[PDB]
Structure formats: structure tokens, C-alpha cells
Design a protein around this ligand. Structure first.
Ligand SMILES: *[C@@H]1O[C@H](CO)[C@@H](O[C@@H]2O[C@H](CO)[C@@H](O[C@@H]3O[C@H](CO)[C@@H](O)[C@H](O)[C@@H]3O)[C@H](O)[C@H]2NC(C)=O)[C@H](O)[C@H]1NC(C)=O
Lengths: 52, 52, 438, 49
């Protein structure tokens, strides 16, 4: 049980870190009607796949 | 004084099952020789089975 | 060459001590504990035996009067009854019809066999331990008797040994003891001079041979029936007999650690607990010069099978290269494994085999032959049998090696998760620093 | 098994063969006597009865 809880805590924390990083990197572009930069659009999965 | 017959042993998982066949009231006792024992002693009369 | 070590206090355990003096070939000693004895110190408190009450023949001073007089007897009772008109086989004497008097007496005394059948009460403290140990090395056998406290040194063929005080201070005998025949009880007997009727210690004596006696049995006398001469009394039964009937349990069948109680003198034998330190001193004739011992180079270890059972259940093979055939002193530098023997024959063939015992699924230990060294790692399988009648010959450790399969899986999973977490942290920090640089 | 039902068995009443398993164990005679001691678990048939 101890090992299982440690594994789950670690994996959830790391996934949260990725989520927070994506929010931080994508929220500025959500305040200007600008390009999604296809080069980063393919790299990082954002809400508009090809819609600007 | 007489000597009673040897009982029949059956081996188990951390348990021993024991058949007792007395001819006259004998004394049967046992203890676990660990740090904290299992004290017990009894006056068996007729043919029985015990688990220890 | 001074030396020191520690050995377990378990009967039959084949302890092996390894001594490596840099100028000489390593030596191996085999020691065993054939017998022990934990003897306490006793202060006899008192003795008890069944009582016997004596009734002197009644004195009837008839057509007259008598007076009661006191004496010094344990629990003395005496009284005078008036109006007696006794009878005898031919006809009733004491012809003065109604002015008569009978004087009754009674007092108690120790039984006839109080020196053959009695129970003693002791106070016990400050146990002392004695032991009998077997020593082998080189070509000398022999078992010797030793006091285990750092105040007895015995010489065995030129070597001097001292056995230090026991690591633990546990004793099965409680503060107060009651001894009968060959049985010891952890009882709390009432103090001297304050016994109670009907229970243990209703009569008490300082020693078996003493004169004084303190008895308290509520002996009471009753007025005789009309026309009789019989001095009736009532008295609660002997306390010793009812203690015999309802003593309850014993210590011989209740002591911990499986150690046998005996008596005369009271002692607890073969009683497994704790560690015994050993301090040695050896002469220079015991070792061997390097020049005559064989040379062992390129030592490699393999394991044929492993089986963590009580008996020696693993076979180990060693390959080497040597110049001349001779003798060497094997040893294992860990307690995870215990080898069976302490010497081996080394020959020009280059391979030798040994037997060892373990108790963990994956042992990993370093074995030395003469002065060489090697590492042995192996995988072990459980034994199929369920019950055996000989005790454990391993030191009973179960934590596996860090390279064992279980810890290999744990390490792989932990490494994967840790690498993933580090990648997460790197991504987030990179994004934050990119945000800052702008 | 000795001590329970069927410690001694025969295929039929008139059969010459017989299978018996009662754990009959001999012992060393005591000094100065001629008595061939032995020890053996009681009959299982009577205890079944
Ligand atoms: C060091 O001395 C002790 C005792 O003097 C030696 O132990 C003794 O070893 C011999 C041979 O192994 C035993 O004799 C045999 O005993 C078996 C027991 O089943 C018996 O069946 C045989 O008929 C034969 O009598 C002897 O009993 C044994 N003594 C004790 C007390 O165990 C020991 O071997 C010596 N060391 C070395 C390296 O020889």
C-alpha cells in the first residue's frame, strides 16, 4: 500500500506540472487574435487544432 | 509406571494435528518456546484429536 | 594477538570466528555452546508442612472444680465445662451427681514427616550464569566449563579465552519463589507471622530443624454432649493440602524461551536469549607462516542450487589457480549465509565445493579461501516440507539483496517514475524561464 | 490409516491376502526379563464402533 500511494502521488503531481506548464505557455496567445504558429501548434496540443 | 503410546502426527501449515489414544487418564501439555509462550495443560480421558 | 567477537546464546549453533593477522595465514575457529545454566541467588524465607493437632486426654475433676491455666504452645486452647455426668463401660462414675468439671486442651504441632514432605519459600535475585562450550581449531578439540562474567579465563591449548557478561538481563524467576520437590512457582507468599487459615502458610517455621512454630488455624472447642467423654473440636483443614490441590500451573511448563527449570539447586538450563561477547588472546604457535601456506589467485564463485531450509541447503563451487596442494580456511564475511565447515583441501585441480545455509530468497556474500576473496550471489527457492524436528542453523535474516529480482523490479519502476517527474520539472522550469527572458 | 476405520482390510472374507497398517513398533527388553515388549495403536474398528 505504501509503495502504491507513493507511485500515484508522484504520477499525479507530475501530470499536474505538465498541465500547469501548458496553461502558462498558452494563456498569452488566448488574449490576442493571432497566429498559433504551426510549428508550436503541432508540438503542443492546444484547443484550436487548425482554427487560427 | 507405564508409558503411553506415541500419538500420530499430521503436518500442516504452522499447525500440527495430533491423534490421542489413551488407555487411562493421562496428562497432555504443550508450550510454544518463543518470546511469549502458549501455556496449556489438560487431562485427556478418551480418544481425541488436538490441533497445536 | 588480541581479538574480540560476539556469538549468539543458542545451543548447538555452530559459531565460526575468523581471525586475520596480516603477517600470517587466516585462521578459523569453531565454537559451540553445549550447555548453559542460569542459577539465581536464594534467601530462604520460611518453610511449610502439613500440621497435626494433638488432643490430650480430658481431665474430669468431679465432685470438685478445676481452673484453666495458660501455656506456651502454638495456637493453644483450653476451657472448662460444668455439669458433666460422664459414663464408662461398666457404669457412670463421678457419683457426686451435678458438681463436676471437665477441662479440655488442644494445641497444634508440625507433622511427623515435615522433614520429608515440605515446601520452601524463597526470595530470588541477581542471577549468575554458567556455561559449557566446545572449541575446535587447527588440530585441537575439547569442551571446557566457563563462568560467563568477565572474571574467568580458561586456557585451551595455549590460547586464552574470556566470556563477557550477558547482553540481556532477563531472568524467568520472579522476585518470590515457592519450591516443592522439583517444581518452581512464581507465587507471592504472605510474609512471616501473618498467615491465614485454610490457605498457604497456615503454619510456618523458620527452618525445618527450628524449634519455634507459628500456627493459625482457628481451632475451637465445643462443650461435650451429655453423658460422654470426647472433647469435640472444629478446625479448618490443613492449608498445605489445599495449596497442593489447587496450586495451579507451574514454571516448568510455562517458562519463556523454552528453557528447562530444575531443582536442587534451582536453575534454568539451556535458555536461549541474547549474545555472549568473547575476548581472546592467542600465541604465535597457533598461526602458520605465509611461506608454507598455499597461494590462491583468480578466485571465482558459482552456486549450483539454493534452498532456504533449516539444514544446509546450498552448494557452492569455487574455482582458483594454485601452485601447491595444501589446506585453507574458508569463511563467509556475512551472517546472511553460514558455511558448514571451516577448513578445505586445495589441490592442483582448481575446483572445490562447500555447503552453506541461508534464510533469504537472494543472498549475496563474500567468501574467502585462505587469503583470497570472492563474491557469491544466487537465487533460492522455498522448501516443500512443512515441519522438521531440528532447529534452525541459519541466523534468520530475510531482507534480500539490492540486486535481487524483487528489488530489481522496484528499482526499474522507481527509476521510470522519477525520470518522468524530472522531465515534468524541466518542462515547467523551461516555460517559466522563457516567460521571464521576454 | 492406523487408529481409524480401515486400518486392516481384506478383499473378501476367505481371501488369503490382508493389508494391515497399525504402526506396530518393538522395544528393547528391560534388564533381567524375557517379555518382548511392543507398542501399537489400538484397533480402529472398535473406535469406529
Ligand atoms: C571432538 O570431540 C567430540 C566428543 O569427544 C566429537 O564428537 C563425537 O564424534 C563421534 C564421531 O562423529 C561420535 O561417535 C559416533 O556418534 C554417533 C552418534 O549417532 C554414533 O551413532 C556412532 O556409533 C559413534 O558413536 C560421538 O558420539 C561424538 N560425541 C558427541 C558428544 O557428540 C567430535 O567429533 C570431535 N571433533 C572432531 C573434529 O572429530
Amino acid at each position: 500500500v505504501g509503495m502504491s500511494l507513493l507511485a500515484l502521488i508522484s504520477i499525479f503531481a507530475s501530470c499536474y506540472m505538465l498541465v500547469a506548464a501548458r496553461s502558462k505557455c498558452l494563456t498569452p496567445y488566448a488574449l490576442t487574435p493571432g497566429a498559433a504558429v504551426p510549428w508550436t501548434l503541432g508540438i503542443l496540443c492546444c484547443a484550436p487544432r487548425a482554427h487560427a | 509406571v507405564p508409558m503411553a503410546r506415541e500419538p500420530t502426527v499430521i503436518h500442516g501449515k504452522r499447525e500440527v494435528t495430533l491423534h490421542l489414544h489413551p488407555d487411562h487418564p493421562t496428562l497432555f501439555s504443550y508450550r510454544t518456546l518463543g518470546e511469549d509462550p502458549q501455556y496449556h495443560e489438560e487431562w485427556v480421558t478418551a480418544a481425541v484429536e488436538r490441533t497445536i | 594477538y588480541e581479538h574480540s567477537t560476539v556469538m549468539p546464546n543458542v545451543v548447538g549453533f555452530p559459531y565460526k570466528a575468523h581471525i586475520e593477522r596480516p603477517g600470517y595465514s587466516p585462521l578459523t575457529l569453531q565454537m559451540q555452546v553445549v550447555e548453559t545454566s542460569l542459577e539465581p541467588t536464594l534467601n530462604l524465607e520460611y518453610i511449610t508442612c502439613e500440621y497435626k493437632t494433638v488432643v490430650p486426654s480430658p481431665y474430669v475433676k468431679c465432685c470438685g472444680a478445676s481452673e484453666c491455666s495458660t501455656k506456651e504452645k502454638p495456637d493453644y486452647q483450653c476451657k472448662v465445662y460444668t455439669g458433666v455426668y460422664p459414663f464408662m463401660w461398666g457404669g457412670a462414675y463421678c457419683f457426686c451427681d451435678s458438681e463436676n468439671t471437665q477441662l479440655s486442651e488442644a494445641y497444634v504441632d508440625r507433622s511427623d514427616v515435615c522433614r520429608h514432605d515440605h515446601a520452601s519459600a524463597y526470595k530470588a535475585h541477581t542471577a549468575s550464569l554458567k556455561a559449557k562450550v566446545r572449541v575446535m581449531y587447527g588440530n585441537v578439540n575439547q569442551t571446557v566449563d566457563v563462568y560467563v562474567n568477565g572474571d574467568h579465563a580458561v586456557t585451551i591449548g595455549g590460547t586464552q579465552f574470556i566470556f563477557g557478561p550477558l547482553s540481556s538481563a532477563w531472568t524467568p524467576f520472579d522476585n518470590k519463589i515457592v519450591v516443592y520437590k522439583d517444581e518452581v512457582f512464581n507465587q507471592d507468599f504472605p510474609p512471616y507471622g501473618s498467615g491465614q487459615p485454610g490457605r498457604f502458610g497456615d503454619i510456618q517455621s523458620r527452618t525445618v530443624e527450628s524449634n519455634d512454630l507459628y500456627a493459625n488455624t482457628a481451632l475451637k472447642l465445643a462443650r461435650p454432649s451429655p453423658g460422654m467423654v470426647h472433647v469435640p473440636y472444629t478446625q479448618t483443614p490443613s492449608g498445605f493440602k489445599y495449596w497442593l490441590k489447587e496450586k495451579g500451573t507451574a514454571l516448568n511448563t510455562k517458562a519463556p524461551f523454552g528453557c528447562q527449570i530444575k531443582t536442587n539447586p534451582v536453575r534454568a538450563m539451556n535458555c536461549a536469549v541474547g549474545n555472549i561477547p568473547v575476548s581472546m588472546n592467542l600465541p604465535d604457535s597457533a598461526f602458520t607462516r605465509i611461506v608454507e601456506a598455499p597461494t590462491i589467485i583468480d578466485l571465482t564463485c558459482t552456486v549450483a542450487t539454493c534452498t532456504h531450509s533449516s539444514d544446509f541447503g546450498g552448494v557452492l563451487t569455487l574455482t582458483y589457480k594454485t601452485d601447491k596442494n595444501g589446506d585453507c580456511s574458508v569463511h563467509s564475511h556475512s551472517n546472511v549465509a553460514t558455511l558448514q565447515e571451516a577448513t578445505a583441501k586445495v589441490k592442483t585441480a582448481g575446483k572445490v565445493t562447500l555447503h552453506f545455509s541461508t534464510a533469504s530468497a537472494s543472498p549475496s556474500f563474500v567468501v574467502s579461501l585462505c587469503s583470497a576473496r570472492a563474491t557469491c550471489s544466487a537465487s533460492c527457492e522455498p522448501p516443500k516440507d512443512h515441519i522438521v524436528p531440528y532447529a534452525a542453523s541459519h541466523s534468520n535474516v530475510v531482507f534480500p539483496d539490492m540486486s535481487g529480482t524483487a528489488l530489481s523490479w522496484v528499482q526499474k519502476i522507481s527509476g521510470g517514475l522519477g525520470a518522468f517527474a524530472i522531465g515534468a520539472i524541466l518542462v515547467l522550469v523551461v516555460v517559466t524561464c522563457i516567460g521571464l527572458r521576454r
